[PDB]
């Protein structure tokens, strides 16, 4: 006869939603993160096939919540620019101006407060044409009727720092090591890790910037590739090099506005004012789109024409490629990259810079990016795309893909797609021949 | 003497007071600080109790085991270890060998648990 | 291997390495880390109390006095311990798990009473 025997410590787990904690080696990766052991461990699980679903993984929601909370906290011990919503007297900037940035930078004078309440000062600052709406040459900041504005602290860097998400004791992180993994379904090669890899909290739309490349071939990941309402995450096999610049020699002035509070403002552009263009390698980009089309044909057919076109419309954050380069917020016009028909040098993108940014598509909390002095270089790797598919087609042998995004969680799904968090249940029973 | 009273005593004498030092392991910025301190104390106690559990010493303060002593760790005789030495000097002496002893105790208990299970299989 | 390494191994092989899993059971992130730590402590202590009320405190492989009912699983020992993994077994007996726990508790109660009565037989 067989008897119940109780075992404690069996390698059993079930899917669960728990809170993970930050570890790291600044807005992100602050001193509240614990230090990371320099020796990671990865305990490969032989003979184990686990079901993954990157589209319902709660650590993407946890990542999003942590990023929102860190962003909100970093703006708390900083100067709130409530007195800056005043009537601006603005004229156009014509000193050495080029023919491309025509009517983009505006010289604006205004009556600013000073250290003493009794007195006011007449001061001037340069503003972009996206951060000025026209009341009634009288202008105001775009946020003054929708949001309170906080200035970012000048000593806090906006550079992303890799953050490792680690599970608490009693829980485990399972990493899918397969190379053809499409985001859903069984994974025959699973390993257990203490923490995730170093994930940079890069904020971008349209195109994905720095990150982890696909190991074998370009991967097309969607919850439902035939459903229009879902975003398509394209993970590159090889990076596409992008060099964005802010060629203007800028300078920063400090305007005292109150008892210890200061506003950092643009003073003048030393030299010619030129467009902050960005260059993406042309041959690499075309080769990459050829790979993307070759992979899409496995989902839509090998007799379907694949078309690329630019964004159909929406806010500046989603119709242009937004990113943080050197502390400035760039919105680059990627309608020179999604223009092609696929039948079965470098590319220069104009960009705009915005100083009044309403991050995470919220209403009521605006931030003022203080200007950075000097020219600005960024060299980075395009590692993926967020595409959508145009619906309602009447020509059945062709598909049109346009860039999309704007929901930042779909950026982090490109990094957390390999990881699932499970709860360990070490207690179990089994029949044996032993009797107490 | 109460808590840590047998600190300068020999380990033979100090071993009779283990209960005294055993009961002293358990009891918004200051709220979070004190909850972190209390949870830290609880976790350290539970790690010690789990470690005793996986050695087969759960519920005991003086637990004999089935691991022989290795002269390499210390070749001292019991007339010096227990009668002419304190726990502080001892703990400093066998600090470099603690992990090896813990591993041997864990493996010995695993073998004993398998042996006990088999001894109950027999009808 | 290390933590959960035996998950794909057989039950009679994974049961040889129970201490490896057992040793791994123990402001934005201040309160979240504190909640996670309290949760881990609570789950560990609930498991230890549950082992305690069964009379299995301090042991990882604990034999009991509850007979195996063929309705829970009628597979023999060569199919459970040699040709199965723990995750498959957990799926197999999940529905009946609470029933087993109840019987275990009841068994310990009887064996707790009987032992007391023997200690009273002067």
């Amino acid at each position: 006869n067989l008897w119940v025997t109780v075992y404690y410590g069996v390698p059993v787990w079930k899917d669960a939603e728990t809170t993970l904690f930050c570890a790291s080696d600044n807005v992100w990766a602050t001193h509240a993160c614990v230090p990371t052991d320099p020796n990671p461990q990865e305990i490969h699980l032989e003979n184990v096939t686990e079901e993954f679903n990157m589209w319902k993984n709660n650590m993407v929601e946890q990542m999003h919540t942590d990023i929102i909370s860190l962003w909100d906290q970093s703006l708390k011990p900083c100067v709130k620019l409530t007195p800056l919503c005043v009537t601006l007297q603005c004229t156009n900037v014509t000193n050495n101006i080029t023919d491309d940035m025509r009517g983009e930078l505006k010289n604006c004078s205004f009556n600013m407060t000073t250290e003493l309440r009794d007195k006011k000062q007449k001061v001037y600052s340069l503003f972009y044409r996206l951060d000025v709406v026209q009341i009634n040459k009288e202008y105001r900041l775009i946020n003054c009727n929708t949001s309170a504005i906080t200035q970012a602290c000048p000593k806090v860097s906006f550079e992303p720092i890799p953050i490792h998400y680690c599970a608490p004791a009693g829980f485990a992180i399972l990493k899918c090591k397969d190379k053809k993994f499409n985001g859903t379904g069984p994974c025959p090669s699973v390993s257990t890790v203490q923490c995730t890899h170093g994930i940079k909290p890069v904020v971008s739309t349209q195109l994905l910037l720095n990150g982890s490349l696909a190991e074998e071939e370009v991967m097309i990941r969607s919850e439902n590739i035939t459903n229009n309402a879902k975003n398509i995450l394209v993970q590159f096999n090889t990076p596409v090099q992008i060099n964005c610049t802010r060629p203007n020699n800028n300078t920063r002035k400090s305007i005292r506005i109150g008892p210890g509070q200061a506003f950092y403002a643009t003073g003048d552009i030393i030299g010619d004012i030129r467009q902050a263009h960005c260059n993406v390698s042309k041959a690499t980009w075309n080769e990459t789109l050829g790979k993307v089309v070759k992979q899409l044909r496995k989902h839509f057919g090998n007799n379907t024409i694949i078309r690329f076109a630019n964004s159909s419309g929406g806010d500046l954050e989603v119709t242009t490629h937004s990113f943080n380069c050197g502390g400035e917020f760039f919105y680059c016009n990627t309608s020179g990259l999604f223009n092609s028909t696929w039948i079965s040098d470098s590319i220069t993108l104009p960009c705009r810079i915005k100083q009044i940014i309403n991050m995470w598509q919220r209403i009521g909390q605006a931030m003022y990016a203080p200007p950075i002095q000097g020219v600005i270089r960024c060299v980075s790797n395009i590692t993926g795309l967020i595409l959508t598919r145009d619906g309602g087609s009447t020509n059945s042998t062709t598909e049109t893909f346009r860039p999309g995004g704007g929901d930042m969680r779909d950026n982090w799904r490109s990094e957390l797609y390999k990881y699932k968090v499970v709860k360990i249940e070490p207690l179990g029973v089994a029949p044996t021949r032993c009797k107490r | 003497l109460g808590f840590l009273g047998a600190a300068g005593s020999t380990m033979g004498a100090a071993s009779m007071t283990l209960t005294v030092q055993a009961r002293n392991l358990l009891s918004t910025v200051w709220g979070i600080k004190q909850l972190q301190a209390r949870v830290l104390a609880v976790e350290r106690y539970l790690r010690d109790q789990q470690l005793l559990g996986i050695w087969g010493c759960s519920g005991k303060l003086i637990c004999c085991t089935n691991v022989p002593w290795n002269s390499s760790w210390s070749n001292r005789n019991l007339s010096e270890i227990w009668d002419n030495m304190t726990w502080l000097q001892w703990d400093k002496e066998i600090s470099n060998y603690t992990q090896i002893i813990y591993g041997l105790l864990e493996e010995s208990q695993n073998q004993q648990e398998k042996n006990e299970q088999d001894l109950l299989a027999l009808d | 291997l290390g933590f959960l390494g035996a998950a794909g191994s057989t039950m009679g092989a994974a049961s040889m390495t129970l201490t490896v899993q057992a040793r791994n059971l123990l402001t934005v992130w201040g309160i979240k880390q504190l909640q996670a730590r309290v949760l881990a402590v609570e789950r560990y202590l609930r498991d230890q109390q549950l082992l305690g009320i069964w009379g299995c405190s301090g042991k990882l492989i604990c034999c009991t006095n509850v007979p195996w009912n063929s309705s829970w699983s009628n597979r023999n020992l060569s199919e459970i311990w040699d040709n199965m993994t723990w995750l498959q077994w957990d799926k197999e007996i999940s529905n009946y798990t609470q029933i087993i726990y109840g019987l275990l508790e009841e068994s310990q109660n009887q064996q707790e009473k009987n032992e007391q009565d023997l200690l009273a037989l002067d």
Partner: nanobody, 124 residues
Framework: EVQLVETGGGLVQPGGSLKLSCRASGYTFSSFAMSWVRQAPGKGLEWVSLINDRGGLTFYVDSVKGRFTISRDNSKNTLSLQMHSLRDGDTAVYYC??????????????????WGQGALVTVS
């Protein structure tokens, strides 16, 4: 097939000490318990010794409980039996057998599957 090849020997003083060794092949060594069973020259069988799969557990009859040691080396797939002191009643052919006990995880045996050819131990 399963083959159990004893070596040992037999020429021992009445108060002497001997060691038998037994090799096994044709099956997984580390998963069967083993035993020694003796047969006096012309009489019936007697069980002598039992060893578990892992070599940690030994069982003996009362008549040899303080004299015989049974040991197993799973890495070299060998069994050994060390006899000390001995006595006149120990004249017998000794056989290895696979069986007689099993771990809780595996099915029960309480019987002997394969018997080796054995070796004759005679005390002069």
């Amino acid at each position: 097939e399963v083959q159990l090849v004893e070596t040992g020997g037999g020429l021992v003083q009445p108060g002497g000490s001997l060691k038998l060794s037994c090799r096994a092949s044709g099956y997984t060594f580390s998963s069967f318990a083993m035993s020694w069973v003796r047969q006096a020259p012309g009489k019936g069988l007697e069980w002598v010794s039992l060893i578990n799969d892992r070599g940690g557990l030994t069982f003996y009859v009362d008549s040899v409980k303080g004299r015989f040691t049974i040991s197993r080396d799973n890495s070299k797939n060998t069994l050994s039996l060390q006899m000390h002191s001995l006595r006149d009643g120990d004249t017998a052919v000794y056989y290895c057998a696979t069986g007689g006990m099993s771990s809780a995880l595996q099915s029960s045996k309480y019987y002997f599957d394969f018997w080796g050819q054995g070796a004759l131990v005679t005390v002069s």
